[model samples]
Target: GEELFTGVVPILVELDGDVNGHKFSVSGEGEGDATYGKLTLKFICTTGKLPVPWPTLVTTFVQCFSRYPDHMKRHDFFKSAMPEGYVQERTIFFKDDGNYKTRAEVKFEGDTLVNRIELKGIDFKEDGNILGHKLEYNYNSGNVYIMADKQKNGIKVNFKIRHNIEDGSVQLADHYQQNTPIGDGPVLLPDNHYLSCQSALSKDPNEKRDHMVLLEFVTAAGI
Candidate 1:
């Protein structure tokens, strides 16, 4: 891995259309199968310095880009109510809970070629609120994903890369446990992002086209 690192590391780069500003770069590609992709993360824009805390500053990528796709994306605040016709009138309940999704495409290896992602679903818990039930999410598809209905820990990344997954990327909607990221082994993708696990798709290069691997999967949320 280090050898590949020494060459010309290609940190993930979010496209160029971002006008709000992009602090952290997100890049990825496909491998094995066109649907199977991976992602990783990196730091940019005057990140942590000497006086600044590495832990605090380095982690700014998520806090900085906080526009829409980065951090502070959407559904940022609590909305006990839906739009208008999604659910019943009484079914809507805006709790002002900070619970939201932290979606992003991460590319740890390969430059522009591939990357991975760390999808987090959390329900902020108050400073002194007792914990019980959390948000909701899929298990097997949720490697580093979970849902907590608390307040204190609002920025809990329920899902992250636990092992070197077989495919390239796991769908954001797959957090729903139905989708997976698209990939190609050595490469990855960087456009797919969402609160729900999107789709776990991999490219089919070989004759039959169907090579993949399986890593240990855990559930941040239980049924």
Candidate 2:
């Protein structure tokens, strides 16, 4: 892997457009179907560092993105809602829930792909504040638009890639399973930063198409 690292790296440039200012980078080990590795994290205008004492719920929030396609097919949140209208509506009772379906659509504009989701008639809070959900994703550009009710509150994120060596790029959005074990091996850390499992995806040229790897928790000592 380090041998490939020594070669000239390709500079990845996001196409000119409204990318929401998020950036991305790619690096790793292996090639094609054999590719197995991690990519460097791109911190936006600010440092990559996250705020401390961050709400633990961010895990679930992130998982929602990966789980979206499935949620749309099965209406994971409100199974009771049905689909008949291109634009549909139904309420997810704050306390009462059942099995049903709603509505979700996926399409492409040039190289840009978008997933628009709406969950009608869902309960939002005990106070009876209920609103439908909406979300959009620009797959090719990696720009994400999130609904305040569904995504909660946060800045949208966009992604891109740079191929330098054995490292390639992959897009893995399998149903987000928050509990997937990360890392095939283990590391030793005497003292470290909070460990939270993450995932790294790379694109492959073979039948495998893409590979997903769980990232082990990191400690400051490694730095």
Model 1 earns a TM-score of: 0.20
Going through the candidates in the order shown, the clash numbers are 84, 15
lDDT of 1 at 170: 25
Candidate 1: Cα lDDT at 156: 30
Model 1 C-alpha lDDT per residue in residues 1-223, reported as the tens digit of each score: 1122223233332321111121232222222111112222332222221211111111112111111221322322111111100110001111332221223333333233232233222343342111222221111223323232233212233333211212432212211121222231221111223232222223234423222111111111121
What lDDT score is found at residue 37 in candidate 1?
Answer: 22
Question: What's the alpha carbon RMSD for model 1?
Answer: 18.7
Q: Write the per-residue lDDT of candidate 2 for residues 131-208, one digit (tens) a residue.
A: 111111111211222211223211112212111111233222211111111122221111111111233423233523
Scored by CA lDDT, what does every candidate get?
0.22, 0.20
Off by over 4 Å in 1: 1-4, 8-97, 107-180, 184-223
| TM-score to true structure, per model | 0.20, 0.19
164 Cα displacement, candidate 2 (Å): 41
Q: Please tell me which predicted candidate would have the highest lDDT against the true structure.
A: 1
